[PDB]
Point group: C2
Chain length 259, copies 2
């Protein structure tokens, strides 16, 4: 953690302390115990052919200027019809009020496993994701200490959720291999230059032994790329930017799955 991400962390700490005040762990521990019971995310992620995780940003970039209001429930449903193996919801709760409600509306609308994409630095946030209906969380191996990585993985496992461990480089990969993570996502982003490139998963995928399920995220927008990743042993891919920019996102899901 250093730079703009350091400034984000600083804000996250404030927000988390404020939330703990209003809803202490004990109250949230109970809430999570009574949420929709967790589906098996990792299982959805491995069949004969590479699987699609379709990601929704939990926020209306139009901020209400589009009428008929932003409706992620209907969006997720159309992704599910189009063959998506799982839905991802990028929540931005620390910067927008109702973001987490969008995660709940998606959870109610689909039968697929739901991955919550946010920035987890505290055990209290794993409980929050469970209480909102998530079946999986993300963990940033470049950010967390090797102790917190294992503690957060184990607590997710304790609550019934899968934890996908993000890696960006060779040093992140060894840390995830050290924490014995059975589920890794390669983020195709140079964290220094903010350069997106498929070359990251191409170089790094081979440093992950067979047995661990590999997911790839970033720079995928053609069916050619999807077949290339499937040739690489990659069991699933996440798409977010390609969907947000398609004139018909569900049609892009079908194109990416070759349907």
């Amino acid at each position: 953690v250093t730079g703009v991400l350091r400034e984000i962390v600083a804000h996250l700490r404030e927000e988390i302390a404020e939330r703990k005040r209003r809803v202490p762990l004990d109250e949230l521990r109970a809430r999570a115990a009574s949420a929709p019971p967790p589906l098996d995310f990792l299982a959805a992620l491995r069949g004969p052919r590479i699987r699609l995780i379709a990601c929704i940003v939990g926020a209306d970039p139009s901020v209400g200027a589009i009428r008929p209001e932003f409706d992620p429930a209907a969006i997720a449903r159309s992704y599910e019809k189009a063959g998506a193996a799982a839905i991802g919801v990028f929540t931005i709760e620390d910067y927008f009020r109702g973001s987490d409600e969008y995660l709940q509306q998606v959870r109610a609308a689909v039968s697929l496993p739901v991955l919550r994409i946010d920035f987890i630095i505290d055990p209290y946030q794993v409980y929050e994701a469970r209480a909102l209906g998530a079946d999986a969380i993300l963990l940033l191996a470049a950010i967390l200490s090797p102790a917190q990585l294992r503690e957060l993985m184990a607590l997710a496992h304790e609550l019934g959720m899968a934890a996908m461990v993000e890696v960006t480089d060779e040093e992140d990969v060894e840390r995830a291999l050290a924490a014995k993570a059975p589920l890794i996502v390669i983020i195709n982003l140079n964290w220094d230059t903010l350069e997106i490139s498929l070359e990251t998963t191409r170089r790094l995928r081979q440093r992950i032994p067979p047995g661990i399920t590999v997911v790839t995220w970033g720079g995928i927008h053609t069916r050619e790329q999807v077949e290339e990743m499937e040739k690489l042993g990659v069991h699933a891919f996440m798409v977010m930017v390609a969907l947000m920019r398609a004139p018909d996102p569900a049609a892009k899901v079908r194109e990416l799955l070759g349907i």
Copy 2:
């Protein structure tokens, strides 16, 4: 489809925010605000040197929302960039999703004597008067998104207010649009919009299509002295840096390193 999905949603939010701002601050009030401000400095002149010039860019927002102790202070950051040798300061304002992003541009403007470029998303003449009332000496115009009439209308409004208008180009079609509009100042954006992939290939591929006499800026994926020297060798007159300055431990030393100078 050029304007689809998320970009359509942003523009739609902009259109609505501009209409609301217009009703609270009408054109004749804002025109007098612009006319009241100290006059814009010459931004084009700051970019014509014998060496390539650095436009050092600051984001006009606090991602910590106040949690960072010592509070975010862009005035002092801009002063450090000026001291280190920048030719101009760019301020990225996000006034359509954060409230007082424009107050940071005013803080920067009071703090330096360099020309100040306002980096934001201009689609309406109202926003050109706004940038001038906030102290801007230059604006950006995205040629790929404006109609030819709109592009020419916004360039002429900027000129009539004494500001420079930097026309952004992303590909060969954009360049021809800019040259057809007789733009004196063009910035090549080093970004494949399709993938959100950043690369200097764009500037290399498009620089020869722009005749001498037109001032060329390059923006995106610049972070080493060798890249700066290569662009200078291409006759590029200025470069914008934002990302590399924020990741830098000492941002003022990085400015000096990109210019190849000491103190």
